[PDB]
């Protein structure tokens, strides 16, 4: 069957920022975001930390209060993990149930695989 693998965005294709650049190159992979959810991770994706809605960041960013790594990192949310290799159908009730609309497929050994998402997997059952 048709499985989370053959559709997830590949590790090396996830867009995401290492929180341990300095605050201005920061701002600036954030601003420059591809992408509507991006992970802030430290260091690699062998430490991913948060799943963060870039249209919220953007938001607080725009307020009075001065943004900071700090505001930031407590508007991420923490990231959902799919266990790689589960199967469209299953993930499609697991999201539905999750309302959640994008994962980190991950490894037994907790190895990130790629991305997931809602979009991705209806798109596909359908074509
Ligand atoms: N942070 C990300 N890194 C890599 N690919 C992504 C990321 N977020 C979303 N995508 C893919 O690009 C598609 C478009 O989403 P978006 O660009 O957020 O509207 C999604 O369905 C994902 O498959």
Do not use: C
Not at 15 to 34: A, E, F
């Amino acid at each position: 069957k048709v499985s989370v693998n053959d559709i997830m965005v590949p590790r090396n294709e996830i867009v995401g920022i290492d929180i341990n650049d300095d605050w201005k190159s920061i701002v600036r992979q954030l601003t420059h975001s591809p992408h509507g959810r991006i992970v802030l991770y430290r260091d690699s994706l062998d430490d991913a930390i948060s799943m963060l809605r870039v249209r919220e960041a953007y938001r607080l960013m725009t307020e009075k209060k001065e943004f900071t790594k700090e505001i930031m990192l407590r508007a991420a949310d923490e990231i959902y993990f799919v266990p790689e290799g589960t199967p469209l159908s299953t993930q499609l009730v697991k999201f539905q149930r999750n309302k959640k609309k994008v994962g980190l497929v991950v490894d037994e050994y907790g190895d990130i695989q790629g991305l997931v998402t809602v979009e991705d997997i209806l798109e596909e059952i359908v074509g």
